[PDB]
Amino acid sequence: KVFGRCELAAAMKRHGLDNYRGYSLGNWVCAAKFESNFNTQATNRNTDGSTDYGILQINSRWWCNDGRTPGSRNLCNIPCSALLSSDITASVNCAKKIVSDGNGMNAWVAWRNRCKGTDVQAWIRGCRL
């Protein structure tokens, strides 16, 4: 599913991301924009052989099982395919574990490079929330 910007903001709020670990909703919407362009089915293979999945491009090296990432962990205890659902529950639940891990949203390289420090509130401006 390709979410609309405000549609995803509403879904992320409903699922408890707004100010999760002190990160405002616009941070999460921004990270989803540049990670997946709001497409739940986005995938991208990394040079290390791991793959990133879903709206927040959660990686198979640590966080989910895809059966093809040697030496990897599955700390969210989910198949990576769960991260491609129209329903964002699995992605959100896993993202909350990732953002709790120590480096906050710096775990998402696109967030650090394209959202951090910017006027992220622009990403929710206009939306009925």
Ligand SMILES: [Cl-]
């Ligand atoms: Cl947009």
Ligand SMILES: [Cl-]
């Ligand atoms: Cl915000």
Ligand SMILES: [Cl-]
């Ligand atoms: Cl694996």
Ligand SMILES: [Cl-]
């Ligand atoms: Cl394969």
Ligand SMILES: [Cl-]
């Ligand atoms: Cl594990």
Ligand SMILES: [Cl-]
């Ligand atoms: Cl699995």
Ligand SMILES: [Cl-]
């Ligand atoms: Cl933090």
Ligand code: NA
């Ligand atoms: Na894995």
